[PDB]
Design a protein around this ligand. Sequence first.
Ligand code: HEA
Ligand code: HEA
Ligand code: 9Y0
Ligand code: CU
Lengths: 42, 312, 552, 79, 145, 203, 139
Amino acid sequence: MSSTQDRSQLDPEVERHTGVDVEDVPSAEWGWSHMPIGVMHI
Amino acid sequence: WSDALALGWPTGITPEAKLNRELWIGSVIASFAVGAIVWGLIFWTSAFHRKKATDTELPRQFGYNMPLELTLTVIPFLIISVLFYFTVVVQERMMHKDPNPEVVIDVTAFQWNWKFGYQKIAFADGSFDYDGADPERKEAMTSRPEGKDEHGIEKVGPIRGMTPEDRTYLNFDKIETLGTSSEIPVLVLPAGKRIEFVLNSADVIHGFWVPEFLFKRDVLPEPKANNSDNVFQVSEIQQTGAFVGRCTEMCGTFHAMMNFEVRVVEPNDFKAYIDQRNAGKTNAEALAAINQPPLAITTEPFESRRGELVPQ
Amino acid sequence: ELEARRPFPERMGPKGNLIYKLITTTDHKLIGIMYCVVCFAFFLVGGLMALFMRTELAMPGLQFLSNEQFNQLFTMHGTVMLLFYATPIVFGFANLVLPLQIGAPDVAFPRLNALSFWLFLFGALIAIAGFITPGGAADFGWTAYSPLTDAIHSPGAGGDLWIMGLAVGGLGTILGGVNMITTVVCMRAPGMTMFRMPIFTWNILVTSILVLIAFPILTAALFGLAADRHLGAHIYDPANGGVLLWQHLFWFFGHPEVYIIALPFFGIVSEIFPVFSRKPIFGYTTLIYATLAIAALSVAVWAHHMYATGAVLLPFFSFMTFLIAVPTGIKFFNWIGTMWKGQLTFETPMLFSVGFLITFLLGGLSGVLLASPPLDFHVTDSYFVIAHFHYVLFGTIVFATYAGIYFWFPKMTGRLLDERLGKLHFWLTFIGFHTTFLVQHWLGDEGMPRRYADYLPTDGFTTLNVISTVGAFILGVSMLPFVWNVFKSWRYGEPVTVDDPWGYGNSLEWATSCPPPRHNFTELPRIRSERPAFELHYPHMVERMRAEAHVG
Amino acid sequence: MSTALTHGLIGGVPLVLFAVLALIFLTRKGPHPDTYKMSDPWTHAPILWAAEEPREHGHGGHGHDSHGVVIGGGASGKW
Amino acid sequence: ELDLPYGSALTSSGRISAVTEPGELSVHYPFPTMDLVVLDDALKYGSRAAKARFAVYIGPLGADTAATAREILANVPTPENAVLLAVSPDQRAIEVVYGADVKGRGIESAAPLGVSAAAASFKEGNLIDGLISAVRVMSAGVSPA
Amino acid sequence: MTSAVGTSGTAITSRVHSLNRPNMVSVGTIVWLSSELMFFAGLFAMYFTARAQAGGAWPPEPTELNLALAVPVTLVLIASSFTCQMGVFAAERGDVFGLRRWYVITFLMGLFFVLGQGYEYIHLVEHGTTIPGSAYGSVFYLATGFHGLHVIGGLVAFVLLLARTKMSKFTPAQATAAIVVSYYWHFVDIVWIALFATIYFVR
Amino acid sequence: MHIEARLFEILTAFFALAAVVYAVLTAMFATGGVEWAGTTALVLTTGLTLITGTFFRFVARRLDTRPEDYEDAEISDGAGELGFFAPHSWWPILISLSFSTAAVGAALWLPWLIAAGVAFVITSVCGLVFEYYWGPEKH
Ligand code: HEA
Ligand code: HEA
Ligand SMILES: CCCCCCCC/C=C\CCCCCCCC(=O)OC[C@H](COP(=O)(O)OCCN)OC(=O)CCCCCCCCCCCCCCC
Ligand SMILES: [Cu+2]
């Protein structure tokens, strides 16, 4: 009970449309969440 | 058939060994019978497959058969009781502890090899006015007047007033058949004689096995202080020739290099060997003097090289 | 009238769904899965050491192993496979199924059991870390006899790391035993009286009692040895009763240790047999009484491993050894009766259970032969003992553990292991094991004791050693089918959407969704007998369950 | 004794036995049903598969209710 | 009311505790596990872009295939944003059904495309590959809400 | 969020309703104490087997046990046991303050026992007897020092539980924690009674 | 809770019998009298089972028959709020790592490492014990 829900409005900026999706990374839009697989393989 | 049913016995060369072989063969017969009946039961119940013709009719679901359980829990008591009685009677013939042995061998076993001292030879027929020396047994009683302190401490010793490295237990003898890393020790015994083995270990615990004796015993560092029976008689050795022996307890890194030999000869050959060993002559020289191979024939002091791929 | 289900369940799961749980998991099921995986990894390590020893032993010369390298090999192999694969995997199966089997939501002290798992894992890692040291791991055998274990003999750091790793693993095992006894004593279903819980939980309770009886002695002995090594503390000075002191203490530990290694898997097999026999475990009360007698006698016959020391009351320990051999016979006949007259279907779990029976029988014949000191004298500390305890162990903790895995894998995964792969794995394992360890009876009967790196070509036992190596490599290849089966059936593999993938189940872990819910249960049946799930799924049978029960 | 011979034995007998047993077992029909041939009639019970893809807001079934199927189009085909 | 023919019992709560004999399986779907997994991928993450619950109904949908397709869509958890492809190979009949939420997202145009892909695959002689192709085509057609 | 999903007055409650069912914390601590008894059994076995192997004078000449500093420490440990039991008596009630007072004085007396044992160790080592020095010295030091480590662990438990009582409302769970800590301390003093009787009285 | 106590009572009886018979048959008929190692181990495992069984018997006498001990008990009889069961916690792994540090410090005789491991063990046990009692931060 001793807590209050937080409202966070952060400036977003790629648009995250392509790459990772919130289903895989639940905080995809909150920061860098995708390393391309190509760079990892190389 | 017996040797096949012996599961690889070395044929006994001592009366106790042959009695132990008889006990093993009897116990193997009993265990093979039990295993055969149990495997028969297991296979027969495996034959109770889930037949396709069996409709939706589950088994009897019996369980809890008190009469059968009582029968099969009382009968195993009978088998173990008879086998334990045989065990006790045969065990009785493991150390008769005859106060007057026929030749006493002092088997010292130091870290990675052996030594045999011929503590005493005393034949009933009348001969061998021989005995061990034992002036070599010297203690390490650190009863110094004063220790690191100035006064008062007068410390006696760590244990029973003596230092652990005391070697009071270790008994030495005149005719020592020491074995080196490059020469397998060949202990020489007379056939037909009651041989005492007084066991001791100079450095670490390990074991003294002559597979042809069908018996062994751990050569402990200080048997007496460990409430252990170092001494172990053999009532008689009939078969002559060489019999291998191995360190049958974890000796150290060179635990596999401790193999020794026991070269049982006739009483007259033993007399000649002992006479030629009293006069300064190595074990090899004495064995050759009795027209016998000097070195171990059942084993060799195989290479001290760490292995095959070591570049010499 | 029809449900919208997925064509095939999740194979792997969303990214990052496990790492933080493994670090933080408090649930008993996941901790048991980690136990199983880590214990099987340690089994692979110990088996690799075994194959190294065996490759060296196929030749009279020292082909590639130095004497001390081979000695470290058998030392660490025995220690890994007893104290770091078996005694942990008993508690792995405990955490896996015991809370379910008593209708409990979780273990008594879940943080304590997670601590036990982690203490085990890191104790095992530090014990194994002896190898990376230049000297290597511990030279002294698994038994680690006294004068060879002091600083003077075996001054290596591998020995100290081994001592402390075994100490840490023992603390983990003690915590696990406390946890399991508390769970069985306190946490239990409203109808689950003590005398109607499954045989596996009975075995785990008695095993934990033995764990507490024994492992503290191991910790005391290991701490005394560590004091002797790092302080010259004269604790085990041979001029004292040091060598026999260590013998008595360590064996008072290890012999109850082998019986805590055995009893849980006796329970696993007792769970396996009724379900594939379609009939109740025969003599359930007899099984529990036999387990209690086994533990009681095991606590007090420790010194039949010291027959050749010449320093023990041989008649007393021989009589107790026979007295403890009898209850194992009672249990074996109960298993056979359970198999008796049922619609037997030989799926991989019961193939492994029957393989346990077959191998353990010969192991126990070897044991009863060994029990007699006159016989033990010749066969002591030889490959006859190697064959004895490998038969009993590999039967009771490899065949039985494989049966348990193939049995509870669906109930812990929601997926069935491939049955044909199970067939291949079981038969490869059986053939390889019997080929590798059968000849060792004759190998040790004829003079060739245990812990020999090499032997003379002029000596015998060369063809038999290469036969044993063929068997060991048969086991090595046999391991691959099981690993492939598990790897391809955890995430792929026949989904099981219902309780009892092995129909006609019992013992109450099959009254809940095949992937058990967090807290193990959304529903508990009317617990009225030893087979709540069987009664639930087959209500019509309940009367029969009580009608023919007394007939026997 | 004949290092090459026994090394080949220990290396091959395991592999040979493994291959024999794999042929014996892995070449057996599995319990999975055989693939449904198009010509053969559809014998299996009706199947409905769903994605479980989109979030369901609440998890609890209560408070989801049955507003409407609210069909929003249709299509058809005859192979 | 009747539980499964054997070995399934209704438990205290609603959930049913069913069983199977040791030998046989539970899913019993007449398709290789690999193709079932592929279709699951098509429905699960081959559809996330669509943000529309995609469903496949291989069962028979008799009588007026359209109405029964609507009724089957009623069985989907979220029929309002849901695209269901129901095919009866006994009748050789495909149907696709959507809800009010998936409207104007390209679903209508992708309807004939998905149906044509499924029909082409079926006539080529493979039901499952047609299902997967139709799911992929429709999912790519439907832009996220 | 309205009032609560779980109507519990504390984030942590007793792991069982101890009124009608066993208290798992007490059962588990009792089981673990019974195991630590076997640990001390291994220690006692070491000491006794060393005793059997001395030449009739079990305390060597350099070593002479000091009852002057040995009787007071055992008496103080008994007193600490009694004060721990009164701390338990306070704990069963809601009196966290009485529990804290009794456990504080118990901690002080246990610390005094530890310091007295350390002083006796200093006297013993200064007058010859030492772990590398002799078998008696080593077995005695091992047994008494492992018991001392157990006592120090009990002191750690006392301080940790007093902190825990500071940091949250005294609840039946904390009462249970105090009872189990008291069980451990009682076991510690019992094993000390045995060790003192064997080392000093029986000899 | 009668069965739980009775089990340990039976174990205590057997262990007392075994210790007494071993002591009697080893004081006489043995090469060095009582072994003093097996005898003490048997005596104190008898004591182990005695402690556990005495606690269980006291509890059973003190406790009315629970459903877990009652045949014919319905599931709903045992219904109720089971006690606290520690949810997810990362303190166990930290305790294990700290004890492993202390253990390596003991094996490798590194007194500094032993001290660091002991400090880590105390800290991690504090974290584990206080995890479910650390009141909210008051700023
Ligand atoms: C799971 C592990 C396990 C199990 C279950 C057992 C079970 C038994 N063990 Fe085992 N044993 C070990 C693991 C195990 N052992 C290990 C690891 C060693 C290592 C020694 C070392 O290296 O130091 C060892 C050593 C060992 C020795 C020492 C040999 C030596 O070193 O010289 C002896 C006896 O001397 C022995 C005996 C027994 C007996 C009598 C049983 C019995 O409990 C079980 C078998 C006996 C039966 C009787 C079962 C069959 C019963 C019937 C078929 C009923 C009808 C038959 C009759 C009535 C005869 N064991
Ligand atoms: C659970 C206990 C257990 C198990 C399963 C085994 C299994 C095996 N053991 Fe045993 N063994 C012991 C316990 C065990 N052993 C003990 C306690 C001793 C006495 C120790 C001592 O005296 O100190 C002993 C001793 C012992 C010796 C005596 C060595 C000597 O004294 O000189 C030998 C010799 O061959 C041996 C062989 C084997 C073999 C061939 C197997 C096989 O069953 C093993 C099967 C192996 C595999 C399945 C491995 C294959 C896996 C891979 C190739 C993958 C590897 C991958 C990774 C590591 C990542 N064992
Ligand atoms: C495991 C520990 C390691 C292995 C097991 C050890 C167990 C010991 C337990 C308790 C004993 C502590 C009492 C200490 C006081 C006893 C007095 C004494 O022994 O005599 C002085 C000697 C010098 O003797 P000296 O050179 O001949 O010079 C004569 C001067 N004229 O100091 C010493 O060596 C004694 C120092 C011993 C310190 C041990 C620290 C224990 C803490 C370990 C932490 C837990 C580790 C966890 C591991 C998993
Ligand atoms: Cu030797």
